[PDB]
Structures are given as structure tokens and as C-alpha cells.
């Protein structure tokens, strides 16, 4: 079906209103929520009628072909994808994003373990913990040479409670190329940081 908006962004303490339109004497419909990584859960059937356990802030509405789910006062646990199901057909889903104050990233660095160095490869890890917003510029550099083409990064979904993110970058190299150089640094650039924070080590 046609769900809208495809992406919504609001803050705690607001009301959201997502629509679900249909095509062609039976007001029947279900609404599902999918927390990140969890299986979808049901929180509204037969148009109205909230299922037991859903709080009193969710409310369904509509009739005919246009239906609507309205969240009073968005909360942390409310950050997730929302689908509408008519019999066997389902909507495109609407990812609910939450806005919050800027947060400075807690940066940490970890060198390769000796158990790994004994294998043949070396992996340096740089962690940005609990920051807002998503985008950050992580820069890997050995001594003062910057590296490129051998550093993969990841980011977890927005934490429910504090609406923050986390980013993990991994620089992969050979044991020979590892012990060749000696200094390794991770410089980050983020709006919450006035100056680019550079946490580094030098063991090689």
C-alpha cells in the first residue's frame, strides 16, 4: 500500500501522524511496530481497538481508504519502523527518527591484540560513543601519514533511551606493515567538538 511519510523526524514531546492509504463495508486494518533488530509487534487491530499492553498515547483512526496512526508525545521506545497491514498486503513502512541536543562523542582507541598479531594481521579500532547527530568524520593516520582504502566503519541504530549513535572504525593491515610503522592515531571531526580530537598510541 501507500504509507506516508516514508521518513519522519521529530523530538520528544510531540505528536506524529502517519497515514496509510488503500485501494477499494469492512473497516479492517492492523498496525505494527518494529524496534531495530526485533521482530514486528502488533499495537492496533480492527482500525481502533488498541491491543492490551499498548499505552494510551497511540490512537488509530480513519475509514474507507485513508487510515491514520497518531502518536501523542513521542517517547524513546517509540523510535522504530511502523507498518500498516490490510489482510495480506502491507505498507512501505515509515521510519520514525527522533531529534535531540548535540552530544560530544566519547572517543576511544584500542590497539591490536597479541593473539591477533600472532596470526598475521593487525586491526586497530576507534570508537565514537554516544553522540548526536549521526555524521562524523573519522580519520586514520599512522605517525602523520593518513591511510585510505583499508578502514571499514559501522554505526548502530539510534539508541532508544538517549537518542544517540555510536560509530566503530576498524583499520586492517598486515603484521609486517603493522610493526613497520610505530604510531597510530584516530582524529575525529564532529559538530559537538570545537577542535578535532585526536586520540592515539605509539607501540607498533
Amino acid at each position: 500500500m501507500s504509507q506516508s511519510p516514508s521518513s519522519l523526524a521529530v523530538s520528544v514531546g510531540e505528536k506524529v501522524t502517519m497515514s496509510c492509504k488503500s485501494s477499494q463495508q469492512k473497516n479492517y486494518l492492523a498496525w505494527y511496530q518494529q524496534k531495530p533488530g526485533q521482530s514486528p509487534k502488533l499495537l492496533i487491530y480492527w482500525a481502533s481497538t488498541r491491543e492490551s499492553g499498548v499505552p494510551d498515547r497511540f490512537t488509530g483512526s480513519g475509514s474507507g481508504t485513508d487510515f491514520t496512526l497518531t502518536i501523542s508525545s513521542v517517547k524513546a521506545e517509540d523510535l522504530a519502523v511502523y507498518y500498516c497491514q490490510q489482510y495480506e498486503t502491507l505498507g512501505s513502512g515509515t521510519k520514525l527518527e527522533i531529534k535531540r541536543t548535540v552530544a560530544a562523542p566519547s572517543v576511544f582507541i584500542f590497539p591490536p591484540s597479541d593473539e591477533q598479531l600472532k596470526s598475521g594481521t593487525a586491526s586497530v579500532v576507534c570508537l565514537l560513543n554516544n553522540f548526536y547527530p549521526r555524521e562524523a568524520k573519522v580519520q586514520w593516520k599512522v605517525d602523520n601519514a593518513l591511510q585510505s582504502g583499508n578502514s571499514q566503519e559501522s554505526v548502530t541504530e539510534q539508541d532508544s533511551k538517549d537518542s544517540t549513535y555510536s560509530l566503530s572504525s576498524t583499520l586492517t593491515l598486515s603484521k609486517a606493515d603493522y610493526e613497520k610503522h610505530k604510531v597510530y592515531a584516530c582524529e575525529v571531526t564532529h559538530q559537538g567538538l570545537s577542535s578535532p580530537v585526536t586520540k592515539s598510541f605509539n607501540r607498533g
Binding site: 469492512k26 489482510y87 495480506e88 498486503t89
Partner: protein, 333 residues
């Protein structure tokens, strides 16, 4: 409008040794010789064949009938095991009338195109239903009543693919299933001209509810052999007949032969369990039955070739009784 204990009436003969007669003589009164049909003028009333306590009462009666007629040699439930004598009996469904006691009446819809759910305008009241044969079958409804006008489609919701679709024809097609004399190899013969003639009419009626769509008939999606074949009881013996040649889009004009097998192990419809019967009787076992209805399911999801596909189904015999009790309802005075 309320619920009360119905009673049954039949033309059962106290000397006939067929088992349905012997049961009906014990539980059913004689057929009322003077039936009173009373046509309510300019009155409309709601009906709902899908929430009709009459169907559940008829189910309980047919279970009592089979608990006395077709006693299994072994009855296996996941909490019980029964071994008993299983003597063969004469088996032939006779019509049964269901009547309301004092202080109650049976409303009957005389609208010839009523689909079984909603308001009926040509309402009348009777004391008993018409003659209803308790024919247990799947996929194909046999020996029922026909539509007086045109083909009627009945569903709790046609848009729900999990809801059975009961089709009622207005002109029966004859099916002759015989085991001649592998003692368990049987077959059925059915006129391909009359069957293709009937399939095209049902397809036309389905297209009225799904316009711009091609209507396709295909074989069952799966399940127990009871619902993947046309299963039925003939002379006490359980037939399982392949219906891949009937639910086809390429139906031949010649006579169609359906291969069947007579089985002794059957999955019970009365309850969750298995019932083991004795080997089949010897000789010629023949049943010429009238196909008066269909039990179909529609394939889910949206189509990519603009074709709705319908497959035979069943298994809940309450739907068989609904195919005849749709027009009835017990009301309080």
C-alpha cells in the same frame, strides 16, 4: 431471535435396516405430513450463515450418526486408544428435516440470489427445514440443494483468502464413482462437456466480483489426502479421488476419469485423531452422486499475470451443513 434445542424429522422406516434409518427412528420424529409455509409480506430480516447455531447442532447429530453407523475397528487419539468390533453396515444418506419446538420458529429466505449473509426481503417462516442429506465430503459438495435462479457465491469475506468460499450451482453435474471387481483401486467418471460447461459458468460468476481478471482453476495447494482429493463415504467405504483433472483450465470435452483409492485409515473430521476401518467389502461398489456445490479457496497476494486462482479445499464439515442451512435461522416468537 434466540437459541433453542431443535429436533429432527425424517421418513425413516422402522423396518428398514439401513443404519441412518435405524438411527433416525431412535432420535427423529416422523415427517410432519402438513408443512406450514408462512410468507411474511414486505419484511426484511438479517441472516448470517456463518454464525448459525443450527450448523453446530447438525454437526453434533452427524457425529452421533457416525458413532453408531461407521464404528471404526481402531480409534486413535493422542490421549486415548479404542479397539472395538467394526461390523459393516448399509450406508446411504437420507434427508433430515430440522424443526423448532413450541415457542420458536424457523425463518426461511425465499430470495433466490441471497448470498447467505445480510438482509433478506422475501422472508417466510416454517416449522421444519426441507430434506437435507448428511453427505460428508470435501472439495465437491454432493447431494445438496441447488440454486433456483443462478449460481450463488457465499463467503464470510471474499477479500479474505483464509475464508472458505462455498459455491452453489443451479444445475447438478453427475459423478459416478465405482470400485469394480488391487482391491483398493477405484475410479470416477464425469462428463467433461457438462463439467467444462459448469466451470465456465462459475468462472463467469467469479469474474463479476473480480472484474478485469482471468479466473483459473488449479489443484489443491496441499494438506492431508482428505482435502487434496475428493474424499467421501460410499456404502460404508471411504473413497479418495484425484481431482487434478477437474480443477483445470484445459478441461477436455470427453468423459474425465478420476483415479481413486479406497482407504481403511482415515483422519477423522469429528475430532482430531485417526480412525481405522476394516478392509473394503467385495463386489461392485458404485455411487452415482449429484455435484451440487463446490468448496474453493483463492490464492493470496496480488497477481503478476492478472489471474485469480481458485483451488478446492474443505475439511470442516460445518461448511457442508452451511451450504444447506444458509437460508434458515431459529427465532423466538
Amino acid at each position: 431471535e434466540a437459541k433453542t434445542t431443535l429436533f429432527c424429522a425424517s421418513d425413516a422406516k422402522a423396518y428398514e435396516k439401513e443404519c441412518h434409518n435405524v438411527w433416525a427412528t431412535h432420535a427423529c420424529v416422523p415427517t410432519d405430513p402438513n408443512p406450514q409455509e408462512v410468507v411474511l409480506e414486505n419484511v426484511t430480516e438479517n441472516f448470517n450463515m456463518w454464525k448459525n447455531d443450527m450448523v453446530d447442532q447438525m454437526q453434533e447429530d452427524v457425529i452421533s450418526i457416525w458413532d453408531q453407523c461407521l464404528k471404526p475397528c481402531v480409534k486413535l487419539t493422542n490421549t486415548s486408544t479404542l479397539t472395538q468390533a467394526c461390523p459393516k453396515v448399509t450406508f446411504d444418506p437420507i434427508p433430515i428435516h430440522y424443526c423448532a419446538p413450541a415457542g420458536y420458529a424457523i425463518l426461511k429466505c425465499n430470495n433466490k440470489t441471497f448470498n447467505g449473509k445480510g438482509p433478506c426481503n422475501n422472508v417466510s417462516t416454517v416449522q421444519c427445514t426441507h430434506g437435507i442429506k448428511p453427505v460428508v465430503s470435501t472439495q465437491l459438495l454432493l447431494n445438496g440443494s441447488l440454486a433456483e435462479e443462478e449460481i450463488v457465491i457465499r463467503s464470510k469475506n471474499l477479500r479474505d483468502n483464509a475464508k472458505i468460499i462455498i459455491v452453489q450451482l443451479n444445475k447438478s453435474v453427475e459423478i459416478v464413482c465405482t470400485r469394480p471387481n488391487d482391491i483398493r483401486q477405484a475410479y470416477c467418471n464425469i462428463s467433461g462437456r457438462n463439467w467444462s460447461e459448469a466451470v465456465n459458468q462459475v468462472k463467469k460468476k467469479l469474474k463479476e466480483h473480480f472484474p478485469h481478471k482471468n479466473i483459473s482453476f488449479q489443484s489443491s495447494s496441499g494438506g492431508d489426502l482428505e482435502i487434496t482429493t475428493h474424499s467421501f463415504n460410499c456404502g460404508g467405504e471411504f473413497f479418495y479421488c484425484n481431482t487434478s483433472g477437474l480443477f483445470n483450465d484445459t478441461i477436455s470435452n470427453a468423459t474425465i476419469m478420476l483415479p481413486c483409492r479406497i482407504k481403511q485409515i482415515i483422519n477423522m473430521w469429528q475430532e482430531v485423531g485417526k480412525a481405522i476401518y476394516a478392509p473394503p467389502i467385495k463386489g461392485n461398489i458404485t455411487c452415482k452422486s449429484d455435484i451440487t456445490g463446490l468448496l474453493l479457496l483463492r490464492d493470496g497476494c496480488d497477481t503478476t499475470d492478472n489471474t485469480e486462482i481458485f483451488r478446492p479445499s474443505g475439511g470442516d464439515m460445518r461448511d457442508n451443513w452451511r451450504s444447506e442451512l444458509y437460508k434458515y435461522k431459529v427465532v423466538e416468537i
